[model samples]
Target: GLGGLERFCSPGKGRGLRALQPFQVGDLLFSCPAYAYVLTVNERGNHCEYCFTRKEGLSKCGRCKQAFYCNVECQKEDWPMHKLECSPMVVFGENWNPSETVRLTARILAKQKIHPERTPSEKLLAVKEFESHLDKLDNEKKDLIQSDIAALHHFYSKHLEFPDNDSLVVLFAQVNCNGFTIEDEELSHLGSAIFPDVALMNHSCCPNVIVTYKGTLAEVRAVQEIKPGEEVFTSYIDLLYPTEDRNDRLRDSYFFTCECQECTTKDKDKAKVEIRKLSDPPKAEAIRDMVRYARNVIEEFRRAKHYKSPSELLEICELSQEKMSSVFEDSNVYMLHMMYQAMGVCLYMQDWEGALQYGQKIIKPYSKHYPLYSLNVASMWLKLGRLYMGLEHKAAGEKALKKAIAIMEVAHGKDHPYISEIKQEIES
Candidate 1:
């Protein structure tokens, strides 16, 4: 049984999942475990290798020394998946840092060898059935995929086997487009996972459901009411972005232009573009040029993280953010994106009040622009609360923390331990 959802072909959209029965908000359509999933290197020591939970000083795999687990059960449970990588890691040694995506792709190949027929999505779709969109990829993406293939062979050739180059290219593209960035309850990036069934749901800015992770399981829940016979959609890009920005991201990654209601009407573009501070604004072309600047600055700041020090990080953030504020509205999605990054850099530098100021500016526009139960909004409030509490603003901290609880209680269930921790923090 596919849990009241059925696989069907939408004309011009290949295949998608649709409701066979009505679903209410917060209703779980279904939950499916990843065929292959891997924790980010940053989370290696803390998060369990199998169950994907965080704990203090968990046990490690005796042989490879790379995998950690909460207990023997998790360790044993993960053996079939980890066996493929263990020898490679032990051999690769000092040079053994596999990118999370590469690692997941390798594990996916391992899982296919062990139990190809058993995937939760097998009846509805197969691993190979996932779209490659290889033809749509440009020269740069093509080169990156080729490089990843080289990485695969370099890391796994001795212990594991791979497909022909042509087939491997398709697999890489499939993984690139279909893989999900699994996040914790507060939406912190944890790892990457592939659930072919979860990928069956098509993209929409006004998605009917939201996918959240509970461990390696992809829990598909309706954000609003979805009726029988309607196609199910989940957003593939950030919903807070403008029509142009969202479409651009969708095209670059997912290889499609969204013709969704939001893109067609672009109703929110007005709010995203209007300025509050200036009665006389820059000409239309100047604003477009500024939007381009803000977008590039956002990516530039992100790129710097892998190479630049904190001083350079703060410099890029402050200088670009000031430039954005002069042209784009605070409500502008691109400006808000840059502001969010600025807040992150400020938080990293322990400029608590500076980050708080950015948070305070962001909270209002974020609330209006984002869904009521959005984790992005909740996490910002959580950040704001922590900043206030750390800076000795007790009352405001408590209020902001409550705002986070209001949203998170729905996004993540109230019984989840994260909620309990937040509640006790407020109580104390």
Candidate 2:
């Protein structure tokens, strides 16, 4: 009752397959069995990340035992694709890295009746292609580079190490994944099971779905809705980073640089300019020559409507100028700014712990000039809910999320996308 194909429709172009029904918010999407799933290095490549079926351990297949399954039931479910590459994998078992093995494995097994059938040549070529671009990147320097095959391969190298079965037909059909590789830093078997469905979602700087995993099985659920013929997408960059950093990650990992409205719009250019200005000074002293330089920045912040308590931030700015130049250091400014912003917002929104933590991080840098509970001190809870949620601290996470929503409402107004996203998160 809780599982099965939940969404309907056909896939789209440059996307994967098709489905007919529109996916709405709070809808249950289809869930297939995880043929196998494995965290990058957690299980030593022995089991499936999704199903927890053993792909590793003592009784693993002797050939390409890089992955495993618990029983014929699971193996039968997974065999469609496995049948293709099993032979070559068993034969060349030792030479393959875990990521490579998985790509090959998935490619081989994907040849089922329900799945799109590709020529052996097509599959092998894809293998070669994926392998060619493994890990080799520094996106901080460049906005977005193509997907690194090596990084994908490396994921497999450390994580995949299973015993192989001796089935010849399972071994030899095809063992290459020319399109994807093992060197990808973020690669894992997580997405392998949902390979087809996963491929359908497009890339976005601000995606509608979020990809999370249960062990190695990738689960892409809707965070937002899609109208008929609309594209579904996910962001590779977590929301923690500034816009540019997010753009760079998407560009590099997916092999397609996005031209989403967020990227092409003029609004970002103005924000970038302002951000550059705010980001320029290595420390307050650099601009100290100007009258009330520290005060002015604080004032500008107040004017930007980013903070509700100017006095508190002004106090911190004053103290930072007087004694904690390090807080304003070029490298630390962005975080410091986020710290202050998150602190006040968290408080106003009613996330006490987030408020407290947010305030704590900045109080050392800006405490002297501001009063306790000042708007500037409210944004602290920014990362708190997420941290709690991650640690399975549900109560804390829930509180933090609620407060964040409240504060964002005041700061950004109700209709803004940012506010809407938070509200939706709370509702969900």
Candidate 3:
């Protein structure tokens, strides 16, 4: 798999994992080491992960240790952002093993460790500004951003365990990153972990590669054959809803209204409107009408502001799912996104079983694209905990809850609402 991957040809940028590579459907992406790791608060300034080289002290890349020159040279190397977060690495004490919670926390810390410093000070603000500019040329093609914000809102609404800001922050924090640019750009206060390499993987309605993880080791893999020079893509969200809904969600949340091939071509409504104009439509026409009607029903439920209980939305979604499932299939990325949204919605409603079934189904194909211990995976675990609690599997529920809290603490820090909820749930 590495054979096809190549360094980015651009003047100065991290190479794409999928760029320049011709990846087969089942090819393995990079695999992280499963050995021991140190989970400490980043209290020091710049430092390396592998060699623990500090900028103020000895020089050299911690990972390689070969370049033992000095801190100044080391910070200018390929891993400056990784070295910068050394000041916050508070050790989780001696009990850090490979428990699910530990795995979740590790993932959070990994992401946190790599985030560019976005302090209120001018120097730090410039860091994030540069980060955004870094991706400008590569992602200059704005076609992919269409209406992606709406999807963020959908997920925000659906997951009851997470409120709008919590859901929105963790999900979109990395979506629009510019990566690291040498330009005098300002850094965003949005959490770190939106590394240069991580941001280059563009969004596609039907993405070819996925970032999945087991513990701290993240493994990227190709779910579909990837041609050379083609952008390696992953859906920032579920692809299950109709194009209108999909576009609306994407636009409102992530600030892009996608015009991808799938969003543009998947015409459920146009076909339906055409069929309704006919007195005795053909079978295909009739099917279109049915699909369109279901789409309308879903839109109505999604737009309805007064569904007091999420259960009402759940009933509407499941009903729509039954009708729309055959149409969506595995071929449609937008449909998959919608499916994930529904699952997230059910999770918000506290419908553990429904959330599990749908969340698992939607994420199954792409979970690998997200790093292990990601807040995304943690959301699923939290939902699973609710499911287990409903099923009377208290131990499982508690374990899952602990895992969720650990991840939230890493990503959002200890004061975030998610941490509070998970803590309360675990205690009770």
Considering every candidate listed, which one attains the maximal TM-score?
Answer: 1
Query: What C-alpha RMSD separates each model from the true structure?
Result: 2.0, 14.2, 16.2
| Ten residues in sequence with the least summed lDDT for candidate 1 | 409-418
The per-model lDDT (C-alpha) reads: 0.83, 0.41, 0.45
Q: After best superposition, candidate 3 residue 351: deviation in angstroms?
A: 7.6
Output the lDDT of residue 342, model 1: 76
lDDT of 1: 0.83
- Tens digit of per-residue lDDT, candidate 2, span 1-428: 01322223323225232223566543434322333222344453555422454434423433456546565565565554444445555655666444534454533334332444543223211221222222333444222111223333333333333224332122222222112211111122333332334433456655555443333333445545655545556554433333454566555554445566666663343232222234444543543432234345545666655554645654554454444343334223343554565455554566667655655465443422222222232233444555566557777667866665554443333453545554555555
Worst 10 residues of 2 by lDDT: 177-186
Candidate number with greatest lDDT? 1
lDDT of 3 at 228: 78
Runs off by more than 4 Å, candidate 3: 1-3, 7-21, 31-195, 244-260, 267-428
Candidate 3 TM-score over all chains jointly: 0.37
Over 159-223, each residue of candidate 1 has an lDDT whose tens digit, in order, gives: 56798989889999999988999887556789999887888888888988888878887778887
Q: Among all windows of ten consecutive residues in candidate 3, which has the lowest summed lDDT?
A: 181-190
lDDT over C-alpha atoms for residue 358 of model 3:
80
